[PDB]
């Protein structure tokens, strides 16, 4: 959340920011309590994660060519 970024920088270099939390928590906690959608969204995305693992397992195809 804090970087010196030595003046020979010329850069943003704040990949720490969008790599660690800043938006991953803030823009989704800014509102919306609802107490129950976390589990719903959780298992939607988790079904998609297991589906990615299924893709990685069964990724052997013919390319239509």
């Amino acid at each position: 959340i804090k970087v010196r970024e030595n003046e020979p920088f010329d850069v943003a270099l704040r990949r720490f920011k969008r790599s660690c939390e800043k938006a991953g928590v803030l823009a989704e906690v800014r509102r919306r309590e609802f107490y129950e959608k976390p589990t719903t969204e959780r298992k939607r995305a988790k079904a998609s994660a297991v589906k990615r693992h299924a893709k990685k397992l069964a990724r052997e195809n013919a390319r239509r060519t």
Partner: protein
């Protein structure tokens, strides 16, 4: 993806921040086992080790300071 707890007898302690400072990030917040290996059992044990550290001020809750 090395769990230091594979050869680490004398299981996780809250005084060995020398060893604990590797399971956190620049901010002071615990890292996920999906990215640092760390078999889930020891990940939970080191989670509460880091929490007790933070209580004893051996680690910061955030990098606000």
């Amino acid at each position: 993806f090395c769990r230091f707890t594979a050869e680490g007898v004398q299981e996780i302690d809250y005084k060995d921040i020398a060893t604990l400072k590797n399971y956190i990030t620049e901010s002071g917040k615990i890292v996920p086992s999906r990215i640092t290996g760390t078999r889930a059992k020891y990940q939970r044990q080191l989670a509460r080790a880091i929490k007790r550290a933070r209580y004893l001020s051996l680690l910061p809750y955030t990098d606000r300071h």
